[PDB]
Design a protein around this ligand. Sequence first.
Ligand SMILES: C/C=C(\C)C(=O)O[C@@H]1[C@@H](O)[C@@H]2O[C@H]3[C@H](O[C@@H](CCCCC)CCCCCCC(=O)CCC(=O)OC[C@@H](O2)[C@H]1OC(=O)/C=C/c1ccccc1)O[C@H](C)[C@H](OC(C)=O)[C@@H]3O
Lengths: 32, 61, 458
Amino acid sequence: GLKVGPVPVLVMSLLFIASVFMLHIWGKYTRS
Amino acid sequence: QFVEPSRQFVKDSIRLVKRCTKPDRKEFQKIAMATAIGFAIMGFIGFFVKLIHIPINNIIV
Amino acid sequence: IKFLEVIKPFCVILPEIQKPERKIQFKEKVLWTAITLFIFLVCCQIPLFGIMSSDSADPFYWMRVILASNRGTLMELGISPIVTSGLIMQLLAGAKIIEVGDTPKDRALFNGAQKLFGMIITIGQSIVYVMTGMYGDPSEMGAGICLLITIQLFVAGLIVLLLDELLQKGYGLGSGISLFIATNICETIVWKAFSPTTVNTGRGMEFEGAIIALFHLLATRTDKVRALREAFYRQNLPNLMNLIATIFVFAVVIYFQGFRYELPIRSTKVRGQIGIYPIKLFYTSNIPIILQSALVSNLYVISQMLSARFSGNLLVSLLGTWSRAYPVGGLCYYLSPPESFGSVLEDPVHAVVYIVFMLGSCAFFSKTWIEVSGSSPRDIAKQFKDQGMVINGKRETSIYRELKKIIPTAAAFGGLCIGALSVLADFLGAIGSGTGILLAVTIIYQYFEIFVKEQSEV
Ligand SMILES: C/C=C(\C)C(=O)O[C@@H]1[C@@H](O)[C@@H]2O[C@H]3[C@H](O[C@@H](CCCCC)CCCCCCC(=O)CCC(=O)OC[C@@H](O2)[C@H]1OC(=O)/C=C/c1ccccc1)O[C@H](C)[C@H](OC(C)=O)[C@@H]3O
């Protein structure tokens, strides 16, 4: 289907890692 | 009467092993060194990744 | 092909990797493999967000090391959905339910159905993990938190699928699944040897990494023989005799990995291409071990869940009784390695039954996978006829007989050998376990074969 390349996979993997990291940091901020 | 099939399978096993090509000392050394290099690379890369990520895991959680 | 056609509209919704147009240079392949490995290793340490409590008992601990899994992280499902989808697709193809096809359209449909099934298994396993008591009580966490965790696992599984496909399509050296399994096993072995984590139970600070513990004990007690024997014979923490047994098991499986039957084959169509066809003793490389480990782990999990939900029933007691929970009686007890040599002496029947089960299951899985995976003597003879290859000494008509006299025996004895290696590693207490060490060494051998193929071609 969505025939994509390797860089659009590496970038999305790093984006997901950054997204979960930002989720954890935002949770830390909102807990206090 | 399952003794006969088992004996036949065992005889085939030793026959095949007799005509199998066992690794030589040079071949065994080459494979062992390659496996050691691969194990070192992957295991130590993962070990350092885990060691780096322990403090961040402590910080975020 | 009807089953693939009806699911094609659903199979044309998931992305796929671009096929490389120039052949990828070995250095670029190594770079891509390293990038994917780093991505996976970073993902397997990042915890999930919606986890409320990771204090409950874990029911899938058994084969976590070989599933490339890590509880509470993004890579908690690991390789389970991809391997399950591959297994079911191979079963469908071999048992003649679908057709893989020699057409790129048929290949595209096959590889789309495989990934669709993998994603469905990802969703199902994420739901199971959420709803079987992990992360805390799902009712306490809430539907929103459960959905968020499921989405995180869904995206992680999608990422694993994309990296595995990237490595398969030609950007990487080999396969993503094998690389992840071997990397996790090697990481576990290295961690149980060189870790800096310190645990104190009254005696004092003591690193749980075996070699670091040896060095620390030598420094603390000034080369004392008591310190040496504590470093080698440490029951409560990883010790050095476990490392020695691990190295011995690596050496023995390396020696048995090079066992192979060299068939002298001559080509009759393109005359002059004399070559050799190798029939490895480990015919099915590690499929019997993977199948047996998956079956045993599924049986353990089913037994635990049945003893939890249906406590008091006689049937669940016969299927296995528990007391990390370990089996004490029932069917699951006989499928578990004996705790120690004293356990073997106390119940020799249990040890004999365990060894017999391991060897028989491995042999049966091997001799069944040679028929389901298209590596049976008839299939090998068929490809010999298709490619014109003939054995030198024997006639062209006597090609199937020679393969029938070797391949079934090779597969069965490879099953016995690869089950005996696992049993020996378990008995010797080797870091990584029989399954882990065997998988790691076989995958490293595959990567070494890739190296010696591509470097020789270059
Ligand atoms: C090195 C990787 C391993 C060893 C591995 O990949 O092992 C998973 C195993 O991981 C998975 O069991 C899951 C299980 O999956 C279920 C699928 C549906 C998911 C929930 C709706 C299995 C249900 C059928 C089992 C009956 C048949 C049985 O016992 C027999 C075993 C079986 O054929 O099983 C399949 C998978 O079964 C199993 O792959 C394989 O052996 C594939 C082997 C193969 C061989 C040749 C070619 C290609 C592939 O779900 C649990 C939540 C949990 O998952 C986790 C830990 O997250 C279980 O651990």
